[PDB]
Amino acid sequence: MAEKTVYRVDGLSCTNCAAKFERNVKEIEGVTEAIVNFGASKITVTGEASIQQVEQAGAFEHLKIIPEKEA
């Protein structure tokens, strides 16, 4: 009852690449929204999908994204 998540991402540092990313996410039919910061931050995904799909997309620059966990 929320179906939104954010994962921590590191490596790339350019708004244009962030824009490439969020659009790459939007292309996936599994997600509704995505809010992707990069630089030294995180990648929010919302809809009904997980980083994995975005991970594949991120192969354009080879990013490393980590699902945060505390438990």
* Contacts of the segment 22-29: beta carbons below 8 A, 24+ positions apart: 24/54, 24/57, 24/58, 24/60, 25/53, 25/54, 25/57, 27/57, 28/53, 28/54, 28/57
Binding-site residues for Cd(2+) sit at 14, 17
Report the structure determination method. NMR
Tell me the CATH number for domain 1-71.
3.30.70.100
21: which strand partners?
A: none
**Domain extents for the chain?**
1-71
Binding-site residues sit at 14, 17
